[PDB]
Design a protein around this ligand. Structure first.
Ligand SMILES: CC(C)CCC[C@@H](C)[C@H]1CC[C@H]2[C@@H]3CC=C4C[C@@H](OC(=O)CCC(=O)O)CC[C@]4(C)[C@H]3CC[C@]12C
Ligand SMILES: CC(C)CCC[C@@H](C)[C@H]1CC[C@H]2[C@@H]3CC=C4C[C@@H](OC(=O)CCC(=O)O)CC[C@]4(C)[C@H]3CC[C@]12C
Ligand SMILES: CC(C)CCC[C@@H](C)[C@H]1CC[C@H]2[C@@H]3CC=C4C[C@@H](OC(=O)CCC(=O)O)CC[C@]4(C)[C@H]3CC[C@]12C
Ligand SMILES: CC(C)CCC[C@@H](C)[C@H]1CC[C@H]2[C@@H]3CC=C4C[C@@H](OC(=O)CCC(=O)O)CC[C@]4(C)[C@H]3CC[C@]12C
Lengths: 109, 414, 49, 85, 50, 34, 49
């Protein structure tokens, strides 16, 4: 409910030339966020396989594969490839965010 | 005075005057002669063309063309060099004369020859390509710029002609757009424009409409996407007539499934299913003996490897230019490491390592899927920005890495 | 027209004759000529083609 | 600012044409096609056009006429009439 | 006329000649309907107005 | 127990709102400039 | 209404020629209506509203 009030405030303040940009920008951001989510799962999946090798419970596996990375953020030879893939994923996410930031500028006439 | 009704003209013995005017760069007189006189096709002969190419061809232009071949060899440039060498030592004499005029940068004469040419738009695109590749060569800025300007002028002339023709007729214009080469350059108008990077020609409503129609195939255009997807998921339903068609049930279904749009959608869905199966196998696998789903995953990976090999064969060394193709190939080879490690029943350390290889490869497959999603969503005006921005980011990342090492070095010493 | 075997292909005359042929096509008229290959009738035949 | 419109259309062309050039068989069975091609790659290895060209030439003549008359119609002064007067 | 070099001149001249031929000959503009139809067919606005 | 999924969903929603507000504040003047 | 009808027809694409001509005509009619309405608004206030 507080977020809904925040949204009405934001719309009220920006009811002018900026408004269209805002709304357009808004949708772009959400997509990136969704994208981010669909990455975490995969990472979590991998993380699960790395850490909890032995697990034979549907619900426990479901919970650990879904919301382990979120908790982690809230809180031998693997290192080199791990950092490489971290850099690759960060590249993708950062370019997505930056594209979302300038998305409206190119389309503006 | 000289050209008048009273002074009857045989128009058969004027060849010498035409040759003299042609060599001396007299375009208006050439046009006047062509208005009422000989036939350019009949007049042209092997001996005359050889003399034109040998005696009167400037050595500076020949050196420039040799430099172009040595440095910027192209599919059309090698052919034109072979033609020049042959004549210096389906005949299409008009094309040879047009090329001869273009190389020496005779704008008006080239225009007249193009007007007299049987095939114009293809010739114009080829002239644009040749002039641009010559302009890439830089021995003197004057000619390098004049050739580029002439290429741009010819490109815009071809654009105007093709848009007017497209306005005139639809099906005939589309048919001509893909006309096979008549030995002019070994390629059609479309590929020739692609090689020369004619933004104006490609950035045309007619070409875009034709490309969209091809990208839909025989399935009806503007039939709306949600209907297509619903029919794809429910295969029998498209037989009910939900999806129209451009112009027999077996033919209908074959056309529907052969449309590259439906093919891409099916490929994406199959990739998602493969990723889900990979995730299931990752947490459920017996070290001693793999089960059937693992073998199915192996078969799908083999199919993906075959597709990657096909992409290599089709594209070449330029395939590895993009970093994401390199990443996909590296991940596909990386999966083979885990496959090999799984081959050992003993050495539990090796088994765990192979399991970790599979585990890590899953993430890069997910990143590849993310990339296809990102490209699909941003296939519009933003696309170029995206790709450009992307490369920039990576450089900075690389830069960051080469800093960490140094810091780490220092940290170690501390 | 063009009784002499030599005919001048001036832009004005070519445009005028093209307009005449277009007018005839619009009304589906009949064009009467001599039929000789050489001369102005050659232009008429080419425009008809 | 002038060339933004054409550049992205060019990029869209390149991506779409590149994908279309590839085979359009459903992915799970795509392998089969390749196998078939392999046979063709090994077993085998081991008037109307004039009409279209004439039509294109007709359109070229129309375009030439149009561009020629454009220059004549560009002038808003009839100096020929003044000279005749 | 030599001076006239604009587009759509042959049709105008032919229509004017046909109208002149029909004017004096035949009914001699006895019925306005026929002349109006003939002029409308070739789209000669100025003569129709005048 | 079950709180985690809705909690992360609302976290994403709030982050979306705050991020779009910041980004709008960053480019606010550009559109109005003549 | 003409602008609306022409725009919705232009949305349909069987041949680009008519699809573009209809859109251009719709834009022309829309701007003509804009000019007429702004002139009328300048003329009178309450009657225009
Ligand atoms: C399948 C389930 C488990 C995921 C549901 C979560 C949703 C938040 C995801 C699923 C599909 C996603 C959408 C796929 C397509 C689009 C449209 C896209 O914008 C456009 O393509 C143009 C729309 C316009 O401008 O009008 C922005 C993201 C959105 C809503 C994506 C963002 C997030 C969505 C809705
Ligand atoms: C059964 C599994 C479901 C997940 C399938 C069955 C029907 C499918 C839907 C049928 C139609 C559409 C609309 C479709 O939107 C488009 O056609 C794309 C529009 C555009 O991008 O321009 C997106 C997927 C969706 C919800 C499909 C997604 C997946 C659904 C829900
Ligand atoms: C849980 C699963 C079954 C949900 C997915 C249902 C599918 C119908 C989704 C998955 C991927 C989606 C596709 C991703 C890419 C494209 C192409 C896209 O068009 C383009 O290719 C580029 C132009 C553009 O749309 O922006 C339109 C939507 C489509 C088919 C998306 C719409 C629906 C797809 C096939
Ligand atoms: C020597 C080894 C240990 C380092 C390998 C890691 C690579 C990721 C580094 C090495 C060289 C770097 C490249 C040097 C030159 C370029 C081209 C540069 O873009 C351009 O200069 C223009 C290219 C274009 O736009 O077409 C962007 C970064 C890149 C790939 C740099 C980014 C990262 C690279 C490939």
């Amino acid at each position: 409910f507080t977020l809904r009030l925040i949204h009405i405030f934001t719309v009220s303040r920006n009811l002018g030339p900026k408004i269209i940009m805002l709304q357009r920008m808004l949708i772009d951001v959400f997509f990136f966020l969704f994208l981010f989510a669909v990455w975490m799962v995969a990472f979590g999946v991998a993380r699960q396989g790395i850490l909890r090798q032995n697990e034979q419970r549907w619900r426990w596996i479901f919970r650990s594969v879904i919301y382990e990375p979120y908790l982690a953020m809230f809180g031998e030879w693997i290192t080199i490839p791990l950092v490489c893939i971290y850099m690759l994923s960060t590249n993708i996410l950062l370019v997505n965010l930056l594209v979302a930031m300038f998305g409206y500028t190119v389309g503006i006439v | 005075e000289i050209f008048t009704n009273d002074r009857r003209w045989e128009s058969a013995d004027l060849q010498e005057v035409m040759f003299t005017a042609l060599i001396k760069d007299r375009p208006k007189f050439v046009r006047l002669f062509l208005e009422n006189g000989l036939n350019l096709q009949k007049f042209l002969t092997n001996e005359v063309l050889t003399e034109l190419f040998s005696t009167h061809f400037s050595t500076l232009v020949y050196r420039n063309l040799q430099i172009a071949k040595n440095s910027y060899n192209d599919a059309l440039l090698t052919f034109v060099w072979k033609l020049v060498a042959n004549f210096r030592r389906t005949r299409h004499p008009l094309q040879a004369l047009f090329i001869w005029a273009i190389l020496q940068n005779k704008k008006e004469l080239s225009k007249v020859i193009w007007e007299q040419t049987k095939g114009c738009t293809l010739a114009a695109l080829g002239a644009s390509k040749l002039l641009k590749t010559l302009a890439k060569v830089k021995n003197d800025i004057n000619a390098a710029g004049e050739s580029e300007e002439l290429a741009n002028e010819y490109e815009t002339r071809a654009v105007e002609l093709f848009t007017e023709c497209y306005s005139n007729d639809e099906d005939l214009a589309e048919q001509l757009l893909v006309y096979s080469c008549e030995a002019w350059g070994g390629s059609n108008c479309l590929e020739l424009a692609v090689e020369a990077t004619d933004q104006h020609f490609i950035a045309q409503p007619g070409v875009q409409n034709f490309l969209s129609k091809q990208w839909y195939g025989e399935i009806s255009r503007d039939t709306k996407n949600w209907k297509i997807i619903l029919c794809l998921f429910i295969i029998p339903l498209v037989g009910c007539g939900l999806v129209s068609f451009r112009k027999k049930l077996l033919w209908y279904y074959v056309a529907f499934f052969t449309s590259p749009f439906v093919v891409f959608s099916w490929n994406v869905v199959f990739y998602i299913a493969f990723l889900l199966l990979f995730a299931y196998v990752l947490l459920m696998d017996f070290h001693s003996v793999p089960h059937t789903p693992e073998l199915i995953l192996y078969a799908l990976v083999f199919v993906l490897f075959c597709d990657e090999v096909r992409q290599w064969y089709m594209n070449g060394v330029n395939y590895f230019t993009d970093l994401w193709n390199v990443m996909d190939t590296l991940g596909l080879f990386y999966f083979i490491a885990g496959i090999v490690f799984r081959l050992h029943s003993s050495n539990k350390s090796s088994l765990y390592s192979g399991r970790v290889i599979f585990c890590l490869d899953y993430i890069i497959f997910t990143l590849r899927l993310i990339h296809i999603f990102t490209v699909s969503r941003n296939l519009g005006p933003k696309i170029i920005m995206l790709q450009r921005m992307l490369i920039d980011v990576f450089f900075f990342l690389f830069l960051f890495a080469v800093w960490m090492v140094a810091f780490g070095v220092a940290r170690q010493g501390i | 027209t063009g009784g002499a075997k030599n005919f001048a292909l001036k832009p004005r005359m070519r445009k005028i004759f093209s307009r005449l042929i277009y007018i005839a096509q619009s009304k589906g008229a009949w064009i009467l000529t001599g039929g000789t290959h050489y001369g102005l009738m050659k232009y008429i035949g080419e425009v008809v083609r | 600012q002038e060339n933004n419109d054409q550049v992205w259309k060019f990029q869209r062309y390149f991506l779409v044409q590149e994908y279309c050039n590839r085979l359009n068989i459903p992915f799970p069975f795509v392998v089969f096609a390749y196998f078939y091609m392999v046979v063709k790659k090994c077993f085998k290895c081991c008037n109307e056009d004039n009409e279209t060209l004439a039509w294109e030439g007709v359109m070229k003549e129309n375009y030439l006429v149009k561009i020629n008359t454009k220059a004549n119609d560009n002038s808003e002064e009839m100096r020929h009439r003044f000279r005749q007067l | 006329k030599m001076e006239e070099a604009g587009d759509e001149i042959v049709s105008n001249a032919i229509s004017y000649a046909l109208y002149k031929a029909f004017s004096t000959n035949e009914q001699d503009k006895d019925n306005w309907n026929g002349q109006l139809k003939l002029l409308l067919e070739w789209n000669q606005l100025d003569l129709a107005s005048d």
